Subunit: 482 residues, 2 copies
């Protein structure tokens, strides 16, 4: 009688659907190692069924007005709000992330995308009338067809909604495959959508295998792939999809730089770093941020950070007082502690953290929130991206120096700057090679603004009206008048 057993592994054509011949896997609650659900990865028949059901549904959806489609999405967001407590608790069970975070940042933000896209479509989906001096043309923003979304394990509900909302509003159908790690929230989204009046088949969810992603991505009836994941998955998925001439968009992560100048609001800069590395998860902070502090602020910065970091309550993520939950496995705890020692060995200064805590216990696998300072570029810790509560603080003296250093990365997801100086703020943001920058704050992704990266962090944007360019294409109709 498992804690979060869904009715079946998949949700296809308006109801729960099982195939118990698919690779079995379990959803595990990190804190207790308790098994909360037993699932099966899609079989090939489950894949063909999800895509065929999407393809069949889609044409009627595309013929409806934007406003009509928009209304269903708005009703879904409303239901999601009614259900925020259960959806967020389910997210905490599935991810291990603190409820206090989950209840404001995860499903709510997913609801925000359904609500935003549902409201802007009746204007943002308009094309052009183009006068040509006798003749004229018009352009229509038409859906691509059947889209595939591949999710990752960081804020899984938010990821599913951010892909589903612009895809559906634009007139597409979507088959969505959540991460094997976090299979449960996407099914609720699918169920909610039907209760909101979305026709069956328009948003189908199937669990996955190592085999599942490649069957969806190479399928002849799929027009478009959207992926959130790691670079090596992204490269493989982008080559396969493009090789079939499918549209592709992805967000691939990458530690981003946060730069704090002498004249920063210190307490503000500290909250930003803490968000980016500790309480921090979700799309941008999943993997950590590199914090650069200017010399004359180093000392106020470390001391406010030490104090606050040590105030953090570690514990059961289902409890509202917890700031930081345990890690996914003991193997993670290991990995994070060698990393720590690798840093102590390198010569970086330990500000706070470094060990297994007491007393929080039990039964989770915890690491104290930990700070390294006097970190330098060459250091193994600075170089290797990690999942865990560890902050690397690098010193710098000059603006040109840090820009150079901050930019010398493969990735270009995000970055921010703390300065009180007008000129400096806009300059540093202009010089940073990243998709999304913050001035005097960090990690805020309101659905009104575009989200995505540069360079090896992938392409395309989620949120804002701009997301729709990825889920539609222009059809042009030239009208001979004579």
């Amino acid at each position: 009688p498992l804690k979060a057993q869904p009715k079946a592994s998949h949700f296809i054509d308006g109801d729960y659907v099982e195939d118990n011949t698919g690779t079995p896997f379990e959803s595990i609650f990190p804190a207790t190692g308790e098994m909360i659900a037993k699932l099966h990865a899609a079989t090939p028949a489950i894949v063909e069924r999800a895509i065929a059901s999407a393809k069949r549904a889609q044409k009627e959806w595309a013929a409806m007005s934007p406003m009509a489609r928009g209304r269903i999405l708005k009703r879904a967001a409303d239901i999601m709000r009614e259900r925020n407590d259960a959806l967020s608790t389910l997210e905490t069970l599935d991810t291990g992330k603190p409820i206090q975070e989950t209840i404001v940042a995860d499903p709510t933000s997913g609801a925000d995308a359904f609500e935003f896209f549902g409201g802007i479509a009746p204007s943002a989906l308009n094309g052009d009338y183009i006068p040509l001096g006798g003749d004229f043309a018009y352009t229509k923003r038409v859906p691509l067809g059947v889209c595939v979304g591949i999710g990752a394990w960081n804020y899984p509900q938010q990821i599913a909604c951010w892909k589903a909302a612009p895809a559906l509003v634009a007139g597409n159908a979507m088959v969505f495959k959540p991460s094997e790690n976090t299979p449960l929230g996407a099914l609720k989204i699918a169920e909610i959508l039907i209760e909101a009046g979305l026709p069956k088949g328009l948003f189908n969810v199937i669990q996955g295998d190592r085999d599942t992603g490649p069957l969806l991505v190479n399928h002849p009836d799929v027009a478009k792939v959207s992926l959130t994941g790691s670079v090596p998955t992204g490269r493989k998925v982008a080559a396969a999809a493009a090789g079939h001439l499918k549209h592709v968009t992805m967000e691939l992560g990458g530690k981003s730089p946060m730069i704090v100048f002498d004249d920063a609001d210190i307490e503000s800069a500290v909250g930003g770093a803490m968000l980016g590395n500790f309480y921090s998860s979700g799309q941008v902070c999943s993997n950590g941020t590199r914090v650069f502090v200017q010399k004359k602020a180093k000392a106020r910065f470390l001391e406010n950070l030490k104090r606050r970091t040590e105030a953090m309550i570690l514990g059961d993520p289902l409890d509202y007082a917890t700031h930081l939950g345990p890690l996914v496995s003991k193997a993670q705890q290991e990995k994070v502690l060698s990393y720590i020692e690798k840093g102590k060995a390198e010569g970086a200064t330990l500000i706070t953290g470094g060990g297994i805590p007491n007393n929080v216990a039990g039964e989770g696998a915890y690491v104290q929130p930990t700070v390294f300072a006097d970190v330098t570029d060459d250091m193994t810790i600075a170089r290797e991206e990690i999942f865990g509560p560890v902050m690397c603080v690098l010193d710098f003296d000059d603006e040109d120096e840090v820009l150079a250093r901050a930019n010398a990365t493969e990735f270009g997801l995000a970055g921010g700057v703390f300065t009180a100086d007008l000129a400096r703020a806009h300059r540093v943001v202009d010089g940073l090679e990243a998709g999304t920058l913050w001035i005097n704050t960090y990690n805020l992704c309101p659905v009104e603004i575009p989200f995505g990266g540069s360079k090896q962090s992938g392409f395309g944007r989620e949120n804002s009206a701009a997301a729709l360019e990825h889920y539609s294409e222009l059809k042009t109709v030239y009208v001979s008048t004579g």
Copy 2:
């Protein structure tokens, strides 16, 4: 001294550049077989130089205002217009296309892109200010970096310009590789841009062999690839580019449907079919079009067509009287008259054409423009595309029936409908799965309107403001105000 010998095979960083170590190749005037130029395919050192120079130049160009960038492009267009005679003679030499098409449709259309993008950029390139109740964000449309353009042999100068214009205006640099078949016009585009005040290195042109594409498309400093080509090449370039996480856009052709209903203007429709299969050298038109004619219109349509068609004048493309040039090789000739005999035997009725003309010679290798009626979907002729003056006219009865047959194709570049009826015209065009559609005309591609394909004809658009989306990305800056 050869007829059209450039100073050197390549144009890099402001001047003509040779490397005689590269694979030698020749341009040959398709009529006389005369060798007009000797060239070398790029070596790896040419590739690197071309890329490194575009990378160096691009920084400062990005720094300039859209208007300042636009002025250079507008000056380039003006120069192209002054040299229209020489530019178009050269296109005719390099392609075999009649000077009467070439003089209005090729460099003119190219010059149109430079002019159009030069003028609209100081508005079109604006990002957003997004109010957030107290904070705000702004978005900036930033260039991608170094773009690679891969040319095809139909309308070489137009392709070069239609890629360079939006890429340059947006603040990128471009290395452009024309097709081996048509190496010469792209070099004049490059020289002209320099004359217009384009900084050196921003638009470089290198010749290619089998190995050049892969060197370009895999290079670590290239941010984006734009290809005009066939589906086999498109598939390999897309997968390679996308595997390195580069942006990709492509236009891959494909035979498009032209649907002539009962109530149509037959002379107009006939002319559109002729522009679609005979003096058809378009990005749209270089592969042919499947003409569907409704029951009643067949007889009128065929009669008008047969007369007009036999009136076409074949001969030396450099002559202003010529409607139709010879075919590129004698191997083109042999391959197409087999297509002719293939069709005949299949039961397809020959309406006109079918043989080599006398004496439209010499020197050219000529086949009469030919028409088949009574053609069905199962016939070889409807099945295989080709490049040569052969039209297939297929009969149909009902509108639902034609839509299904016109959509029953993996391609989706373009299409047209000829009907006097208002509703049918907008309905058919809405029902067709293509990027660009014409009502009561065909093959018009003014720069003001988007051009590109759907399905396996590719993705992305050229021309209109929409082209700028594929040559820039949104950088989002969130400003915390308080």
